[PDB]
Design an enzyme around this catalytic site. Structure first.
Site, PDB file in Angstrom:
ATOM      1  N   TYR A 251       0.829  -1.177   0.000  1.00 57.74           N
ATOM      2  CA  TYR A 251       0.000   0.000   0.000  1.00 57.74           C
ATOM      3  C   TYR A 251       0.882   1.253   0.000  1.00 57.74           C
ATOM      4  CZ  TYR A 251      -3.633   3.145   1.887  1.00 57.74           C
ATOM      5  OH  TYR A 251      -4.532   4.096   2.250  1.00 57.74           O
TER       6      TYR A 251
ATOM      7  N   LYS B 226      -1.851  -1.395  -3.773  1.00 54.33           N
ATOM      8  CA  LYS B 226      -2.866  -0.373  -3.658  1.00 54.33           C
ATOM      9  C   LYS B 226      -2.116   0.929  -3.797  1.00 54.33           C
ATOM     10  CE  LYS B 226      -6.319   1.641  -0.492  1.00 54.33           C
ATOM     11  NZ  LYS B 226      -6.568   1.798   0.943  1.00 54.33           N
TER      12      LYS B 226
END
EC number: 4.3.3.7
Lengths: 297, 295
Positions: free
Chosen positions: A140, A168
Site C-alpha cells: 500500500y 494499492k
C-alpha cells in the site's frame, strides 16, 4: 493458468469503516450489517482495518474481532482482506499471523509511516511481513500519509516474493505503474477515488475505495462498463460521482464515510479522536454532494 | 514557569539502546544518559522519534523512562515522548509517564491519519488535560503529514499545561511572532536550524547531533547567549559535517552508528530502521572526523 488476482482478491473493494457504538466500543453487529450492505450493493471484496477503518485507533484485539465478524457475514461470497501493516515490523508480523489464523483472504500492508525508513528498510520490512503467512499480499503505497514512497525499484525487487501480488496505489504514478504492471505482472488497485478511472486506463485490476461506502453500485457499473470496452459510460459515471470526491477532499475518508452512511440510514457511530465526526454544517454540505451524485434523495 | 530550568536548554532526543538480540538495554540507556548530561545536556527526551518510539512497546517506554530518571533525573530534566496517532493511547501513555515521575511530556502531531486541525486541537487538549505535567507540542509535518497551523498553536497556547513547541517545521519568523505573542517556549527540532532558531528567540535545542557533539552545541548556546554570534556561526559550520551524514542515514541510524564509533555501543535499530552498512560507517567516520568528534 496462473494466480487470478481479480477473482482471488476482488475488483471492487471498500476500505470499510470500523463501526463504533455510542460509548466508542467496537460494534460488530453493525460491522456485519455494513459488510452485507456493501457486498449486496456490488463490492466483491472488502478491506478491514485499512486507513479508513481507523486502524490507528483500534487494538489488535478489536481488529481481529472485526475481521471475525466480517468473515462470518460475507466471507463465503466476498474476499476479505485484512489490513496488517504499521511502522513496526515485529508488530506487523504478529498482526499478519493473527489475521491469517483468523481466516483472512489476503493482506494489505502500508508503507511504514512517520519514521521514514530507507528503501532497503522498506524492502526488509515488506519481505519479513510477506514471509510470515501464506496470504496473498498487497503493498500500500501512499507517500501523502507515510512520508516516503515505495520506489519503483523497491516495488520491482519486492515483486519476486511469491506472496506479494499487487499494490494499492495512492501515489498517482500512472506512467510508472503501467510499466511495473507490464514488467512484473503485479496487480494495481486504485487507492484514491479521484484516480479510479485513470488507473483503469493504465491496467489496474480494480479499486480499493472509500466512496464505495456511498456509491458502490455506481462504481460497480463503472468497472463493468470499463471492462467491456464501454469507456464512454465509465467516464460518464466517473463524472457523475465527482461531488463525492469533492466532499472527500473537504472531510477526508473517515469523516466522510461515517457521516454519509448515517445520511444514507446506516448509522455506524462516530470516529475515535484525533479523527472527528462531521459538524452539522458539514453534514448539510455533504448531503448536497450526495444528492448531486445520486446517492441521497 | 521557568521553561529553561524546568525543561532544559540543551536536550538530546536520546536513542533507545538495544542489546544484540534487539531487546531493550536499560543499563546501556543509563550509561548513555550519564554520558550525554556529562557532555553538556541539561535535559533528555526519551522515546522521541530518534528513540524509536514506533518500534518500542509502552512497557519498554516505561522501563526506559525509569532507567533514565534513575540515572540522571537528579541533575537533568527527563521529558517523556507520549504522543501517538491515537488520543486514548496518548492519554494512557501520558498518565503512565507522569506516574513514573517524568518531568515533562513531548507530544507529536498525530501522524499518518491526517486529522483536521479541530481534531488536533481536541487531541492536544485531551492529552494536556490527562496529567499536570508541562507539555511541549512537537510539530513535524515532514513526518506526521499535517502541521499544527499557527491559529491552532495560538488556541492551544492558552492551555495552562502546554508550555512550548519542538519546532521541526522551519517556520522561523512565524515561530518568532508566536513566541512574542504568546510566551510559548520554542525548541529547535532541526539541527540544521539551531542557530536561526536562537536568533528567533528559541529557548534551546532538542537535538539529534547532540548524541555525538553535545559539547560543541553547548558552546554554541553559550556563545549565542553572550552575543558572540561570530563564534556561534563558527561552531555551527564546524559541526555541519554531521548533517551531511544525517541526510544520508537519518537520525536513528546516524546516532547509533556514531555512538558506536565513539566507543559507546548502543546496538542497532529495529526494523524498518536499519544499521548502517560498512561503507556507510566509513563515510560517517569521515564526517565525524571532519566535525572533530572522532580521532
Amino acid at each position: 493458468v496462473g494466480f487470478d488476482v481479480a477473482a482471488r482478491l476482488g475488483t471492487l473493494l471498500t476500505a470499510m469503516v470500523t463501526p463504533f457504538s455510542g460509548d466508542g466500543s467496537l460494534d460488530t453487529a453493525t460491522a456485519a450489517r455494513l459488510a452485507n450492505h456493501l457486498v449486496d450493493q456490488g463490492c466483491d471484496g472488502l478491506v478491514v482495518s485499512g486507513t479508513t477503518g481507523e486502524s490507528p485507533t483500534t487494538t489488535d484485539g478489536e481488529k481481529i474481532e472485526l475481521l471475525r465478524a466480517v468473515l462470518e457475514a460475507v466471507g463465503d461470497r466476498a474476499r476479505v482482506i485484512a489490513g496488517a501493516g504499521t511502522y513496526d515490523t515485529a508488530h506487523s508480523i504478529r498482526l499478519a499471523k493473527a489475521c491469517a489464523a483468523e481466516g483472512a483472504h489476503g493482506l494489505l500492508v502500508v508503507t511504514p509511516y512517520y519514521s521514514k525508513p530507507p528503501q532497503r528498510g522498506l524492502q526488509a520490512h515488506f519481505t519479513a511481513v510477506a514471509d510470515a503467512t501464506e496470504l496473498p499480499m498487497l503493498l500500500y503505497d501512499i507517500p501523502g500519509r507515510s512520508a516516503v514512497p515505495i520506489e519503483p525499484d523497491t516495488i520491482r525487487a519486492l515483486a519476486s516474493h511469491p506472496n506479494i501480488v499487487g499494490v494499492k496505489d495512492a501515489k498517482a504514478d500512472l506512467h510508472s505503474g503501467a510499466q511495473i504492471m507490464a514488467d512484473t505482472g503485479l496487480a494495481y488497485y486504485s487507492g484514491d477515488d479521484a484516480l479510479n478511472l485513470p488507473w483503469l486506463r493504465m491496467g489496474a485490476t480494480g479499486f480499493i475505495s472509500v466512496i464505495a461506502h456511498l456509491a458502490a453500485g455506481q462504481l460497480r457499473e463503472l468497472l463493468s462498463a470499463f471492462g467491456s470496452g464501454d469507456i464512454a459510460t465509465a467516464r460518464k459515471i466517473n463524472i457523475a460521482v465527482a461531488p463525492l470526491c469533492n466532499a472527500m477532499s473537504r472531510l477526508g475518508g473517515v469523516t466522510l464515510s461515517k457521516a454519509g452512511l448515517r445520511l444514507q440510514g446506516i448509522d455506524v457511530g462516530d470516529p475515535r479522536l484525533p479523527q472527528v465526526a462531521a459538524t452539522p454544517e458539514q453534514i448539510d454540505a455533504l448531503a448536497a454532494d450526495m444528492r448531486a451524485a445520486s446517492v441521497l434523495r
